[PDB]
Amino acid sequence: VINFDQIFEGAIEPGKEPKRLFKEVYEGAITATSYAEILLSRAIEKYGPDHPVGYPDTAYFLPVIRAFSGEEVRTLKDMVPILNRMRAQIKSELTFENARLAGEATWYAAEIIEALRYLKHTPENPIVVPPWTGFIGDPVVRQYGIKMVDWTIPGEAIIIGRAKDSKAAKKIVDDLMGKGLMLFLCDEIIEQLLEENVKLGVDYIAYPLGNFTQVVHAANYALRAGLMFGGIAPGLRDAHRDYQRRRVLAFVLYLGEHDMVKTAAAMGAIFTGFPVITDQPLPEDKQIKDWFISEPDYDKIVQTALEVRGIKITSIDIDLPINFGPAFEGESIRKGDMHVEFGGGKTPSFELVRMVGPDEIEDGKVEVIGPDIDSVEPGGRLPIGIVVDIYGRKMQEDFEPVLERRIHYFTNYGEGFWHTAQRDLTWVRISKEAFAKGARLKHLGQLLYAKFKQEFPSIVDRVQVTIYTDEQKVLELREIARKKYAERDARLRELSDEAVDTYYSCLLCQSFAPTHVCIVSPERVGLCGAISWLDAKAAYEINPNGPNQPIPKEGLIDPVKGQWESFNEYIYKNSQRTIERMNLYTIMEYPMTSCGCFEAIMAYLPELNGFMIVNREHSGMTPIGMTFSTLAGMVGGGTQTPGFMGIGKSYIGSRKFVKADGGLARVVWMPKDLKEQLRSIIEERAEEEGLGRDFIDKIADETVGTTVDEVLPFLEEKGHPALSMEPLL
């Protein structure tokens, strides 16, 4: 029902087909299929029809075939019918559809030729040697293709052929790897880059697959994503094509002299929705308007690819003493190696983002008031304050908090920087090697300016940074930052589910939980715990086309359970028609689904007439007879699970917390540490609900027991209200 081919309509005017390209693709597809046929015939003559065939370290047989038509190739005989079908779909009528079919058949033939090549592979005598990868194993696909489909990797570049010269290859490839794109390299371009001393490999997500049919090892890798994270069934061809077009932002760079087989493989990439850009000049009758295009100028080539693919690159190269990269963010200056820590010892510290007018401040201002880092011996400590001023043609005060949390990430983006927490509690810290390598505060303010200009092109125009280090001035501005925090917290305090007419979807976790849809409301945070209603609203207003969308409350169904037709229909359209109803205020009937990053899991226990809760960090056994990870396997994945629900921790303190199930009064068990961490909001909420300030003492924890038999006598002795409430069954 997908009708994927819609996407190609209008690429070609009627009667104006690029017939030379289609003739080349047809000859190349017949050639590749003939190669595969005769090679399979000789393999069967040599080993027998029932001989095993396959790739190392994969659960998906021949993944391209397994996805597009579903066969689980395991022996040579299995390939025989497939090739027949492929030959039948290579048709001589010179249409764009027949060209796409011929490209699909070329992918099938290359996949078969590669598996036949692996007939001689053993771990003791590999056919793959460094630096080439050949077929890439499933574990690499898990680890990096999850980032490929959530778009933390901006895109993928499939480069076949050669660049005009080795330095031009190094130029475009250093450009692409510096913009973070994953690279699949096939043929002589590998040797070009290697003589230019470019590092390459799986650790750099630059895979030198090999030559000729090895290009298919990009395709199967891509298609395994759809088999693996998308959950699409084997043989659902158009569903896999749509998933590739939608999630895998890949394109082909077809460099060097054309040959018919490479062109047929590029047409197969077009068949699954990947545009091809070539450096060769093309006549009009050998090109397609948005799919097979010439960009001879190398200075532009990369740009054109991204523009045709819809990729939007954030990154910008910048002149810094210190190398900047995300991978450092796990670094820590443990107490043996602390250099110049700020904050947390009651040493003053603060951070703030603030909107401003246009003509009272200038772009690029970067000031470091007071002492720099030069003023201390190792092991020292100074007070620090920050100001990041922003003007934008579209900027709003609403965006200010959403940017502040980013400075956290920004500061850990380079070596020797370490920031945890936020606002007045900004535990800023510096490493000794960084001030050994000569980095100072001015470069860090430049780093914040550069990242703010990179990540928000639509909204920020004229931004500047000013740091302060005086112990007295830092407090003078800490007070004003407190005033800003206070007006923001007051605006947050105003919000209730009833005070707003619109909730916000979150689809961010469909990268690994395709049927899951979050609905964020003012009194129910996203179950990851990191997306509030204000956050999803600002993310939509910044990026209207993004994964957070407004949903008006329309079509009321259940006033008490919290069901509306608008939320039902949005979830149904975005859950692949698997979820039809959702109740906001209960877990016992049509609960919201979960992905898998939930901070805690609730479960109803009829034996205790109430809810247990267990946070992700708790590793002990729970009264339901399972630990958190066992329950997580059953509660996540976008499936509706009445009696169970994933939640953020702060939701436990919401006034709306499972209000139709009895709310906080219904909670009978949670881990002791989670109870202590939430003790204040639990005490407040139980007080205003009439349960008493002491209600938290009635909640059982693991020190009372881990089974219902141990827990019930405690609940009876304490008079826990849930025992007098209606059973929820």
- Tell me which residues touch Ni ion (CB under 5 A): 509, 528, 595-597
Residue 99 or 527: which CB sits closer to Ni ion? Answer: 527
The least CB distance from residue 642 to ligand SF4, in Å, is 19
506 annotated ligand binder: yes
Nearer Cβ to Ni ion (235/596): 596
Q: Are strands 353-355 and 502-506 parallel, antiparallel or unpaired?
A: unpaired
| 245 vs 616, beta carbon nearer Ni ion | 616
* Nearest-approach distance from CB 597 to ligand SF4, in angstroms: 5
**429 bridge partner residues:** 418
CB of 619 to Ni ion, least distance (A): 19
Residue 702 in tokens: 């693991």
Alpha-carbon distance of 429 to 264, in angstroms, equals 55
Shortest CB 716 distance to ligand SF4, Å? 37
What is the rounded distance in angstroms from the CA atom of residue 479 to the CA atom of residue 465?
Answer: 19
**Beta-ladder partners of 201:** 206
Size of the site for ligand SF4 (CB under 6 A): 11
**Is the separation of the CB atoms in 548 and 564 below 8 Å?**
no
Judge whether 186 is annotated as a binding position. Answer: no
DSSP reduced 3-state for 545 = coil
Determine the Cα–Cα distance for residues 160 and 190; give it in Å rounded to an integer. Answer: 9
Q: Judge contact between 577 and 678, C-beta under 8 A.
A: no
Q: Which is nearer to ligand SF4, 176 or 519 (CB)?
A: 519
Q: Does 531 bind ligand SF4 (CB under 6 A)?
A: yes
Among 527, 538, 665, 670, binds ligand SF4 (CB under 6 A): 527
Count the neighbouring beta carbons within 10 Å of the beta carbon of residue 42.
11
Residue 342 CA, distance from chain mean position = 32
User: Is the CB of 150 or the CB of 470 nearer to ligand SF4?
Assistant: 150
- Roughly what angle, to the nearest 10 degrees, separates helices 400-411 and 441-455? 130
Handedness of CA 704, 710, 712, 718 (dihedral sign): negative
Cβ 520 to ligand SF4, closest distance in Å? 6
Cα 282 from Cα 302, distance rounded (Å): 18
- Minimum CB distance to ligand SF4 smaller for 469 or for 511: 511
| Contact predicate 552/502, CB 8 Å | yes
Q: Which residue is nearest to Ni ion (CB)?
A: 595
Torsions phi, psi for 591 (to 5 deg) = -65, 150
Task: Kindly tell me which of 150 and 689 has the beta carbon lying closer to ligand SF4.
Answer: 150
Q: Interface with ligand SF4 by CB under 6 A: which range of 192-200, 279-287, 423-431, 520-528? A: 520-528
Stretch of 77-85, 246-254, 522-530, 631-639 contacting ligand SF4, by CB under 6 A: 522-530
500 or 507: whose CB is closer to Ni ion? 507
Name the residue with the smallest CB distance to ligand SF4.
526
| Helix residue ranges, H only, 347-470 | 400-411, 432-436, 441-455
* Residue 439 near ligand SF4 by CB under 6 A: no
Give the chain's radius of gyration (CA, Å): 29
Contact 325, 447 (CB under 8 A): no
Interface residues for ligand SF4 in 458-517 (CB under 6 A)? 506, 508-509
Sign of CA dihedral 494, 500, 503, 504: negative
The number of angstroms, rounded, from the C-alpha of 74 to the middle of its chain's C-alpha atoms is: 33
Give the one entry of ligand SF4, Ni ion, none that residue 506 binds, where binding means its C-beta sits below a cut-off of 5 to 8 angstroms depending on kind: ligand SF4
What are φ and ψ of residue 656, in 5° steps?
-90, 0
Q: How far is the CB of 421 from Ni ion (least distance, A)?
A: 23
- Per-residue binding string, ligand SF4, 123-162, x by CB under 6 A, is ----------------------------------------
The nearest distance, CB 614 to ligand SF4, in angstroms, is 17
The β-bridge partners of 182 are 156
Spatial contact of 49 and 209, defined as CB atoms under 8 Å apart: no
614 binds, among ligand SF4, Ni ion, none (CB under 5 to 8 A by kind): none
Q: How many residues does the chain have?
A: 729
Measured from the Cβ of residue 165, the count of other Cβ atoms closer than 10 Å reads 12
DSSP 8-state code for residue 3: -
Q: How far is the CB of 509 from ligand SF4 (least distance, A)?
A: 3
Work out the burial of residue 70: count CB atoms within 10 Å of its CB; fewer than 13 is exposed, 13-18 middle, 19 or more buried. middle
Rounded to a whole number of angstroms, the minimum distance from the CB of residue 530 to ligand SF4 is 6
Neighbours of 653 (CB within 10 A): 16
Q: Which does 460 bind (CB under 5 to 8 A by kind): Ni ion, ligand SF4, none?
A: none
- What's the DSSP call for residue 237? H
The token duo for 627 is 């630990």
596 binds, among Ni ion, ligand SF4, none (CB under 5 to 8 A by kind): Ni ion
Angle at 391 between CA 390 and CA 394, to 5 degrees: 120
Q: How far is the CB of 412 from ligand SF4 (least distance, A)?
A: 20
Q: Closest distance between ligand SF4 and the C-beta of residue 504, in Å?
A: 9
Residue 265 interacts with which of Ni ion, ligand SF4, none, CB < 5 to 8 Å by class: none
Measure the CA–CA gap between 52 and 104, rounded to whole angstroms: 24
Give the one entry of Ni ion, ligand SF4, none that residue 664 binds, where binding means its C-beta sits below a cut-off of 5 to 8 angstroms depending on kind.
none
Which of ligand SF4, Ni ion, none does 531 bind, CB closer than 5 to 8 A by kind?
ligand SF4
CB closer to ligand SF4 out of 508 and 678: 508
Cα 136 to Cα 133: distance, rounded to the nearest angstrom: 6
Contacts 24+ apart (CB under 8 A), 289-298: 289/11, 289/12, 290/11, 291/8, 291/11, 292/18, 292/21, 292/266, 292/267, 298/163, 298/164, 298/168, 298/171, 298/172
Scanning residues 165 to 184, which ones bind ligand SF4 (CB under 6 A)? none
Token code pair at residue 170 = 């190094």
Select the binding partner of residue 518 from ligand SF4, Ni ion, none (C-beta < 5 to 8 A, by kind): ligand SF4
Between 73 and 592, name the residue whose CB sits nearer to ligand SF4. Answer: 592
Report the residue number, 385 or 526, with the smaller CB distance to ligand SF4: 526
| Closest C-alpha among 315, 320, 317 to residue 455 | 315
Closer residue to Ni ion, CB minimum distance, 407 or 506: 506
Tell me the closest approach of the beta carbon of residue 581 to ligand SF4, in angstroms: 19
Contacts of 123-126 with C-beta under 8 Å, sequence gap 24+, read: 123/56
Residues 587-606 that bind ligand SF4 (CB under 6 A): 595, 597
Assess 522 for contact with ligand SF4 (CB under 6 A).
no
Identity of the residue, 218 or 597, whose beta carbon is nearer to Ni ion in the bound complex: 597
SS3 content of the chain, % helix, strand, coil (to 5): 45, 15, 40
Helix (H, G, I), strand (E, B) or coil at 563: strand
CB of 491 to ligand SF4, least distance (A): 21
Q: Interface residues with ligand SF4 (CB under 6 A)?
A: 506, 508-509, 518, 520, 526-528, 531, 595, 597
Residues of the binding site: 506, 509, 518, 528, 595, 597
Residues of the binding site for [4Fe-4S] cluster: 506, 509, 518, 528
Residues of the binding site for Zn(2+): 509, 595, 597
